[PDB]
Amino acid sequence: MNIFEMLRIDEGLRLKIYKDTEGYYTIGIGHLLTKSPSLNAAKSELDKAIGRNTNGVITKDEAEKLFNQDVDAAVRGILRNAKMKPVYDSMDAVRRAAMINMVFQMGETGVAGFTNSMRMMQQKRWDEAAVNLAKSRWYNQTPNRAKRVITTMRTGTWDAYK
Ligand SMILES: [Cl-]
Ligand SMILES: [Cl-]
């Protein structure tokens, strides 16, 4: 198991534009197209991203290419962020993966606002941080996924995904 398999499980794969759990237009492996309510706007964003006239449908290969870019962007977003980097650097590989999952879903923004959890994480107070992360809109909205990620963080193992 790794970050790619892990997120492909959390996000699934859809080749037609769809609405995510917040009702935003998405496609592929969790790639958000836009926060606007226009499907047109979504279709245009999809075309600009793939570089062709898609008409709201992409291939598997195109999905994967987006996903690759997006995982990459999540990692670099972390490394570039001054509060996150040192947290991420302090951890082992499994837990880093939990962190990337969070950033991928919620954006650099959303995740940097878990300050308190980040401190605990940096101190390696796993059970505590686990309790803290669950007091969040994130856990309340997408609880099954949130649990998977939080277990990973807590245990440092891939059990929740096996
Ligand atoms: Cl893009
Ligand atoms: Cl969920």
From Swiss-Prot:
It catalyses: Hydrolysis of (1->4)-beta-linkages between N-acetylmuramic acid and N-acetyl-D-glucosamine residues in a peptidoglycan and between N-acetyl-D-glucosamine residues in chitodextrins. Substrate binds at residues 32, 104, 117, 132. GO terms for biological process: cell wall macromolecule catabolic process; defense response to bacterium; peptidoglycan catabolic process; viral release from host cell by cytolysis. Belongs to the glycosyl hydrolase 24 family. InterPro entries: Endolysin_T4_type (IPR034690), Glyco_hydro_24 (IPR002196), Lysozyme-like_dom_sf (IPR023346), Lysozyme_dom_sf (IPR023347), Phage_lysozyme-like (IPR052619), T4-type_lysozyme (IPR001165). Changing residue 132 to M/F: 2-fold decrease in enzymatic activity. Its main location: host cell. It comes from Enterobacteria phage T4. Disulfide bonds: none annotated. This is Endolysin.
